[PDB]
Design a protein around this ligand. Sequence first.
Ligand code: HEM
Ligand code: ZN
Length: 180
Amino acid sequence: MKGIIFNVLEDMVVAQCGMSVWNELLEKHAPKDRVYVSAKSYAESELFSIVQDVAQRLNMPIQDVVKAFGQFLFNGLASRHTDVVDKFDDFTSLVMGIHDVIHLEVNKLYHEPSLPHINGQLLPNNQIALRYSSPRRLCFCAEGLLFGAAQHFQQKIQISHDTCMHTGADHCMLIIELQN
Ligand code: HEM
Ligand SMILES: [Zn+2]
């Protein structure tokens, strides 16, 4: 888990709960004197432990917190990597470009990143079928990021997530319908 993800999480937690809460979370869940360097890889367990704590504090499902973070995360990534996002003229182009374009540019900018397996099909009814697979099981973060990307492009969307790893499947299937 690259530090940039933790950095955007910090922005969210600090903005919503204050720096003392963020530092408390780091004391509880990260090694002593932890500082998240954007380019460096960290144990994904640190991220999950932090988000698990937040979710339990709010008495919410962890996956709803993860989805909220995902939506927040798109702007966090877009802001830090504007050149990458600027490559896309619309929502559909971005989503269909996750596999080819995003994956490439991240591997160019980061040392040994851990990216999900994402594959998109544009269907003749102009729905997008997005397959997700990852050991991290962060499909709800993916769902959140898609909504974030939709907001960015001023595009309204609906997502059906009727196959999911969290129920035992070896992948998730996110059907994205663009609406008016
Ligand atoms: C709708 C658009 C996107 C989706 C669905 C998506 C999906 C994801 C997900 C779900 C993760 C969590 C890791 C995992 O699941 O294994 C991730 C990680 C990541 N994504 Fe994306 N992403 C999107 C856009 C972007 C963009 C625009 C960038 C720009 C650079 C980006 C760069 C990254 C980076 C740097 C990581 C962390 C990799 C690591 O921790 O090693 N993503 N992505
Ligand atoms: Zn899923």
